[model samples]
Target: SGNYLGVSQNFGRIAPVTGGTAGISVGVPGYLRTPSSTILAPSNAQIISLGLQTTLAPVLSSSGLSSASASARVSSLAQSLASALSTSRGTLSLSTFLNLLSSISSEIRASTSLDGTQATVEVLLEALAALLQVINGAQITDVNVSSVPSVNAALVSALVA
Candidate 1:
């Protein structure tokens, strides 16, 4: 009843594809990137943030990421965007961001072979792009920070340490 799964059961299957872990980066480019890897897009960062916000809010709230910083970048965006929200002005809202993130995580967790992309990274990137439409009142085909609610704040605050 308590038998454990061993490395040979899992690692062996990954060996050829991951090349002994060197190929790990190739699998999760949306998350961590090495010098040999391309930089993540703004959409990528947002997706990452959203995943943290929705899936790990309990952890993030403990880390003081949810506190409002009057002098910080995101609060500035939220304050300014609050006006736009009344007119349906900006792109995504806090509630929408949370919803999309949770959806993506659920969608990807059961998926396999994302054209060889890692499940977590790909979903995170996708979540960001979807939410971009809400916060900016525009599309984010190029990954710009201006498209997000609080730059790093929105995501980080939603995450736990």
Candidate 2:
């Protein structure tokens, strides 16, 4: 058996405590952070990504805020995540990043209510949130980009625009 994101087998199973994807299977709904509040039981990676985006702090600082370079930081983060996903090759660490990305992406769509040009902003925010989660020590699991809707390309374009 192969390992995914440090866990052996059992991808997509909800873990206890953090409610993130893991090897353990309790059939319980996973919970994630959102901008306004905590969301319960997001089934897919896309939804999870959106949740992270909504609740994620503006920055990775102790206070979870950053008044300066917020948009620029988000743009940079999106580019990095997109690169990682493209090069992951099903590695354990990449899996963790993928899961985190999914969580944030879910929030961008649901909480940000982005349906237009701002979709780029939503992606940036989501990517930033994932980076924050890693900085804050959150566990993650393996996930495929194709499994969820691909928004990184659009997000990257937005950053350039």
- Per-residue lDDT tens digits for candidate 2, residues 34-122, read 22223533345543343334345444333323332243335434444443444232222335555554455443342223344655565
Where model 1 places Cα greater than 4 Å from the true spot, the runs are 1-40, 63-89, 92-161
Model 1 TM-score (2 dp): 0.19
Best by lDDT: 2
Cα lDDT, model 1, residue 153: 24
The count of residue-pair clashes in candidate 1 stands at: 12
Tens digit of lDDT per residue, candidate 1, span 43-157?
Answer: 4564344344434543334532323111122322343344343423333456655455345324322222222333234345435543543455532242234334323223332
> How does candidate 2 fare on TM-score?
0.24
Q: What lDDT, from 0 to 1, does candidate 2 have?
A: 0.42
